[PDB]
């Protein structure tokens, strides 16, 4: 249970980082 | 009157030690709660970890205030150097006072002492600002050159008593170097301090075989090796990132602070991981903790870099801008540890029974990937450029 | 290819910690050998102090080799950064290996391990030199620019496998800053680590009065205050000295190393001095030890300055040359601690029964003297201008 | 005894430092 929860939290963190990357890409 | 660079470097060297002071109790904890004494030892460890994180954040706030203070001020002399020394002395009590307050939240004395320490730091910083302004040549060229000097006479003085704010890049680098150097060698200090075999111990519990005594300590040596490798490679990613940064916005400072706070836990992670599990199920938790701590340490470096890319035009050097010569290399270098740690963590669930092996393989591969990263990126960009 | 300044700064941050690692056992010693346990405890303390000094000198030799190595080299890249990290990892074992060898001088294993560590450091440095020379742009501008490059290909490579030699001033400053920052805060790490009053202890042995526990801990706080003040003011003298130094000859490096090695003992000196005497007769010995350690710490800064004056024409800035604007001020600043400590030590014999009082008065006078040194020197020059 | 011995050693140290100072002075 909790391992999957923290794994999902980490996936969300990398996803938000990628979203910021793409926002910067478009803003370039 | 002279250059203040070195006294700021010494201030950062002091602040790194003060910020990371509270990890020593965490790594000196009772690692092996045999007979399942976890029921209390883990509560104690969580209390210690919470105290460490809170003290690190508080001391980092103090360091931030210090760097802005000696960013409006841009000179040094005997009086300013001694006042800065006094301020540093007053900052070194934040960890102890905060720990005392947390240990005795009911007793007003702890909170009174913490408030006294904060007020003392503020008072010494106000003295520094007043002394600097009474002699205008000590201020930064802009503040003294500005005709609106009367407003700056009040602005930062009130501050001592925002995500676009430019922090001092040099001092962010200095504080990061101090924290990484402290953390990397954190658990070799213990080995030197209390892990040298005593002559009588080898004689009695090892029959005089020194090699057996050294083998007994072997696990802590493996812990140190892994911890130093991981923290040094995280510092290498940090150093590569900041080599290409022109300005450090307060958002980058916040992300760097989070990265350092989570880096501080790597010694504990490797110390637990090297204390091999008494049952197969237990090693999985240690490997998961190690992987999540590594990911938290490195993903915030990556987040700092992306926050920089959001204003790359003014914040990052052209070599790293979108489509730059080294943009792909920079992304690979910063995301090497996040992705590797995340995959090794997923392996703890989807491929659980091989998790420890995959984690050691990640430890052996990430250094090689960093060493060969230029060649691998070249090969990848030659492959997905024709194909 | 890029600037290597930051990786050298991180190397110095690591080297300071590694050099001063061995003072932690010394300050964790049994300060109170009650029932006259001195007969063995002092022998143990002397062994620990000897080990600390020897390890500090060995690690300083390693740091000197490192700075020369990254002084023929003048650039960096991923490969050089990682090789330097490996070299630093191999250097961090010198203290443990040397302590193991000293603990077991008869057993060949300890000396074998120490030799293996030294050979590993040399091997990694040779790898760094070879990599740097295989890519000529990585060398310093002179080495690559010079047509004599063929002999430099062999010179330092043989060295890795003299008192006029120019050391790197920046790296001497960085190592000194690291050592001073570690030593000044050495015994606040102890207080934060183990000197937080436990809730049960205050309840049982202090009836629930937290202030009583804090009073019991007081002496360690006095020790920390004195130690931080002394070490910070010694660093201030060091910083003032090096602000006016243009080059650092190997003689200055040796004297600086001695100064730092003797500075490392100040935490122990103040910790003993605050462990008030059971028989006040040995408080004289405690004060004598404190004064002699302070004098040894500062007299070598003064000796470094004079060794620099011997070639001031090429080594010192004009402001500090003989007859310079700040020559008298520099002399006063550097000799303030040696003279005060020597006078207090003399008072320990000629005025023994007031020696503790004179020492506590010196601890208060020297900071003020540094704060007012410019005004006092101006007054002295005005007096010796008509008289 | 020994306190006076180490005091004399310290006096000798400061004396040699002063001698170096004077040598530099003359060399100036």
Swiss-Prot record, chains A, D:
Cell location: Lysosome membrane; Endosome membrane; Late endosome membrane; Cell membrane
Modification(s) after translation: O- and N-glycosylated; some of the 18 N-linked glycans are polylactosaminoglycans.
Lineage top rank: taxon: Eukaryota
Transmembrane segments: 1-28
Subunit structure: Interacts with ABCB9; this interaction strongly stabilizes ABCB9 and protects ABCB9 against lysosomal degradation. Interacts with FURIN. Interacts with TMEM175; inhibiting the proton channel activity of TMEM175. (Microbial infection) Interacts with Lassa virus protein glycoprotein.
Annotated family: Belongs to the LAMP family.
Function: Lysosomal membrane glycoprotein which plays an important role in lysosome biogenesis, lysosomal pH regulation, autophagy and cholesterol homeostasis. Acts as an important regulator of lysosomal lumen pH regulation by acting as a direct inhibitor of the proton channel TMEM175, facilitating lysosomal acidification for optimal hydrolase activity. Also plays an important role in NK-cells cytotoxicity. Mechanistically, participates in cytotoxic granule movement to the cell surface and perforin trafficking to the lytic granule. (Microbial infection) Acts as a receptor for Lassa virus glycoprotein. Also promotes fusion of the virus with host membrane in less acidic endosomes.
Protein name (database record): Lysosome-associated membrane glycoprotein 1
Originating gene: LAMP1
Stretch of the intact protein here: 383 to 410 of 417
UniProtKB/Swiss-Prot annotation, chains B, C:
Effect of residue 182 to N: Impaired selectivity; can conduct both K(+) and Na(+)
Annotated site (Hydrophobic filter residue 3-2): 189
Protein name: Endosomal/lysosomal proton channel TMEM175
Residue ranges of the region described as Short helix H1-1: 29-34
Superkingdom of origin: Eukaryota
Region feature Short helix H2-1, mapped onto this chain: 36-42
Function (record text): Proton-activated proton channel that catalyzes proton efflux from endosomes and lysosomes to maintain a steady-state pH. Activated at low pH (under pH 4.6) by luminal side protons: selectively mediates lysosomal proton release from lysosomes, eliciting a proton leak that balances V-ATPase activity to maintain pH homeostasis. Regulation of lumenal pH stability is required for autophagosome-lysosome fusion. Also acts as a potassium channel at higher pH, regulating potassium conductance in endosomes and lysosomes.
InterPro entries in alphabetical order: TMEM175-like
Source organism of the structure: Homo sapiens
Substitution effect: residue 360 to A: Increased potassium and proton channel activity
GO cellular component: endosome; endosome membrane; lysosomal membrane; lysosome
Segments carrying motif RxxxFSD motif 2: 171-177
Residue(s) at site: Hydrophobic filter residue 2-2: 186
Motif RxxxFSD motif 1: positions: 6-12
Positions marked as site (Hydrophobic filter residue 1-2): 182
Pathology noted in the entry: Parkinson disease: A complex neurodegenerative disorder characterized by bradykinesia, resting tremor, muscular rigidity and postural instability. Additional features are characteristic postural abnormalities, dysautonomia, dystonic cramps, and dementia. The pathology of Parkinson disease involves the loss of dopaminergic neurons in the substantia nigra and the presence of Lewy bodies (intraneuronal accumulations of aggregated proteins), in surviving neurons in various areas of the brain.
Notes on activation and inhibition: Active at low pH (under pH 4.6): proton channel activity is activated by luminal side protons. Polyunsaturated fatty acids, such as arachidonic acid, also activate the channel activity. Proton channel activity is directly inhibited by LAMP1 or LAMP2, facilitating lysosomal acidification. Channel activity is activated following interaction with AKT (AKT1, AKT2 or AKT3): interaction promotes activation from closed to an open state. Activation by AKT is independent of AKT serine/threonine-protein kinase activity.
Main location as per UniProt: membrane
